[PDB]
Write a protein that binds this DNA or RNA. Structure first.
Length: 577
DNA sequence: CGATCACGTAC
DNA sequence: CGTACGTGATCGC
């Protein structure tokens, strides 16, 4: 049982508590707080938010760093409280992050899933209480209050066994000194938001909508008929039945119309290039023009992404609503989308700094490959150097195509090399791709040793680890199905690389946030895109940031090879190039 | 109205 | 061949 409290009392403000500040809306930016639960040595309390969040003593308790709180997904509460002008401090245990570190593959997304890991089931899943999708609703106060108190009581009960296992895993510091501080930095980034030049976005959509109608009309002529070009089904009928184009790849229901397939068909018919062009144009229009405009706040013209810190199997962040980690950059036409991301104050600028080849640098370090490490110590172009080695030529004799093929091998090596997936990438045979890989491993025998050893370790221990002791369990490493076992071996190879690079940029972010405060700079972190950080800052801070940000990022850890950071700034994200 | 499947964008 | 997220179509409810 529990107290359904009319008033905040002093015994609710003990210096250690499990705290529930319930935000049911999936997107928590400026969202309602539907209820509060406090469990401490003195009892269990449910508070209505309109009462508690107006009580100065409760608010002061929330903001007191010395009053320690155990929570689940504290960034959600912190951000929702930021939008009410209320500061949340003292969060010393985040059960979501603790569960994520212990085993990211559980998909732990609510208190009940984490509690099940320790045989605790006296709490319902959020989806049972709130329902799903259309039927999603906040239940009446008695049902609501019991749920929130059960969650807090679960958090209260679960802190000790989770911290105990984290210690056994040598992951206690990972939680307390990396993920939990990073959660506060992400809350600040999300709350700040990124300012969007919506008028520029709208005028892009207007010229895109002109060009879409042009290509669209040309497509119907060359097809001799109108059809929904966006349907892979109808399009496959125009292409592979009406126009008789060769079927180079079947899907499961019909024929593949992926861009890769369409590349090969363009010589046979003028329609294919137009469908390609229609597809690129339509991708920008629907996902990056219309998509972005839908999530801009009309008052501030900012987008406030949500960084999912407890989701990827490797330790990377993900970004939602909008995803700001996949804004186009490769093709110029899509890169112009970044012109719409602008500083949020006048006479400020966008500063962007990115690690140069952090994954291959991490690989050099963990493999202790003499050749690969020397290449980075010489700051060589790694793709050209790999081509020189694989194809046994001097630098002068590396052709553009050789470099392109060596680059693809370098990507495969990072992702988990296999004869078949490189062959696919390079449009070559499997025996040919196997010869490339064999020649890579002859040139980098330390990388070969590392790939063999880490697979054997994943089989022996049941998991692989990263630099800062993140882990990923790989039960499929022992499967007797070749496809399933191979994916697990590739994950054994890739996760220490991708995950270690994630560890490093997360530590950089923490170190950078500390340095910016020490230096009293107004510069603020806005975004992280896996190996780059995006800031905005007064124009008068650029020269100091040119020195400060790359140094903090490069010194975040010490590897057997240097870390190298490139950096640029400009009046928009596009210009920060 | 979910939910699957293709597809495409980033790193 | 790694890791994500969003959009559109399409099916069956």
């Amino acid at each position: 049982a529990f107290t359904l409290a009319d008033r905040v009392t002093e015994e609710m403000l003990a210096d250690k508590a499990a705290l529930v500040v319930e935000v049911v809306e999936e997107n928590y930016h400026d969202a309602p707080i539907v209820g509060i639960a406090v469990v401490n040595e003195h009892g269990r309390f449910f508070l209505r938010p309109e009462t508690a969040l107006a009580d100065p003593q409760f608010v002061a308790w929330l903001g007191d760093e010395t009053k320690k709180k155990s929570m689940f997904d504290s960034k959600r509460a912190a951000v929702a409280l930021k939008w009410k002008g209320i500061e949340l401090c003292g969060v010393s245990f985040d059960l979501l992050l603790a569960a994520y570190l212990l085993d990211p593959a559980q998909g732990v997304d609510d208190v009940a899933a984490a509690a099940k890991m320790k045989q605790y089931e006296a709490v319902r899943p959020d989806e049972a209480v709130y329902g799903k999708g259309a039927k999603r609703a906040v239940p009446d106060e008695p049902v609501l209050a019991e749920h929130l108190v059960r969650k807090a009581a679960a958090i209260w009960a679960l802190e000790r066994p989770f911290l105990d296992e984290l210690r056994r895993n040598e992951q206690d510091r990972l939680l307390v000194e990396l993920e939990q501080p990073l959660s506060s930095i992400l809350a600040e980034m999300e709350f700040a938001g990124v300012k969007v030049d919506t008028k520029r976005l709208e005028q892009m959509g207007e010229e895109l909508a002109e060009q879409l109608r042009t290509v669209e009309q040309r497509i119907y002529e060359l097809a001799g008929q109108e059809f929904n070009i966006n349907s892979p089904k109808q399009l496959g009928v125009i292409l592979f039945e009406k126009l008789q184009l060769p079927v180079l790849k079947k899907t499961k229901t019909g024929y593949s119309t992926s861009a890769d397939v369409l590349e090969k068909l363009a010589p046979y018919h003028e329609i294919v290039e137009n469908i390609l062009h229609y597809r690129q144009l339509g991708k920008l229009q629907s996902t990056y023009i219309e998509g972005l405009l839908k999530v801009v706040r009309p008052d501030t013209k900012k987008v406030h992404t949500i960084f999912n810190q407890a989701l990827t199997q490797t330790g990377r962040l993900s970004s939602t609503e909008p995803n700001l980690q996949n804004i186009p950059i490769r093709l110029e036409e899509g890169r112009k989308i970044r012109q719409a991301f602008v500083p949020s104050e006048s006479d400020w600028l966008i500063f962007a700094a990115d690690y140069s080849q952090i994954e291959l640098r991490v690989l050099a370090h963990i493999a202790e490959d003499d050749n690969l490490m020397e290449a980075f110590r010489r700051d060589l172009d790694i793709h050209t150097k790999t081509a020189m080695d694989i194809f046994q030529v001097s630098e002068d004799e590396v052709t553009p195509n050789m470099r392109r093929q060596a680059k693809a091998v370098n990507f495969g090596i990072v992702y988990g090399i296999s004869d078949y997936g490189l062959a696919q990438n390079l449009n070559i045979s499997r025996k040919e791709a196997a010869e490339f890989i064999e020649r890579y491993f002859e040139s980098f025998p330390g990388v070969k040793r590392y790939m063999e050893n880490i697979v054997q370790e994943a089989k022996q221990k049941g998991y692989v680890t990263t630099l800062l002791h993140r882990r990923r369990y790989l039960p499929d490493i022992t499967s007797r199905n070749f496809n399933v076992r191979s994916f697990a071996e590739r994950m054994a190879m890739n996760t220490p690389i991708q995950g270690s690079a994630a560890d490093i940029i997360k530590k950089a972010m923490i170190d950078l946030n500390a340095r910016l405060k020490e230096e009293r700079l107004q510069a603020r972190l806005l975004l992280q895109v896996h190996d780059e950080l995006i800031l905005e800052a007064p124009k008068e801070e650029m020269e100091r940031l040119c020195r400060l940000v790359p140094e903090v990022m490069e010194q975040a850890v010490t590897l057997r090879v240097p870390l190298k950071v490139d950096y640029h700034y400009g009046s928009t994200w596009y210009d920060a190039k």
